[PDB]
Design a protein around this ligand. Structure first.
Ligand code: LU5
Length: 114
């Protein structure tokens, strides 16, 4: 019911808005590498990692048939971050900032969709 190119053009601005957040999006632009980051328990806690680069691939290549599937992956990324990091930590605080930006942008777009 959703033309993949129309869904892509409708949702991509909201993804670009997260990328644009600097420094807040820096921890989210690529999949968490627990070896490089010295957090070897990460994958034990986070069973379904998600990040901006994986969402972009799926949005670019028509792997979201419905808008809610895009939104679910965005919130998966946020929930992983809030789950793994302490509420006072950098990554936790950057996550809440990104969730604020995302919520403001997505609701009009979801309204204009469906
Ligand atoms: C690795 C990489 O490629 N990029 C990168 C860049 C920056 N840089 C700034 O944050 C910055 C620089 C200047 C101002 O701010 C920070 C991090 C980072 O802290 N990652 C994480 C550590 C621990 C737990 C995490 N849990 N979940 C997530 C999603 C990410 C985590 C990673």
């Amino acid at each position: 019911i959703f033309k993949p190119e129309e869904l892509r053009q409708a949702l991509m601005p909201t993804l670009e808005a997260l990328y644009r957040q600097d420094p807040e999006s820096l921890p989210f632009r690529q999949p968490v590498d627990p070896q490089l980051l010295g957090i070897p328990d990460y994958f034990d806690i986070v069973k379904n990692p998600m990040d901006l680069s994986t969402i972009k691939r799926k949005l670019d290549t028509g792997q979201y048939q419905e808008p809610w599937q895009y939104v679910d992956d965005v919130w998966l990324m946020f929930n992983n971050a809030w789950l793994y990091n302490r509420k006072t930590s950098r990554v936790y605080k950057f996550c809440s900032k990104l969730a604020e930006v995302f919520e403001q942008e997505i609701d009009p777009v979801m309204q204009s969709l469906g």
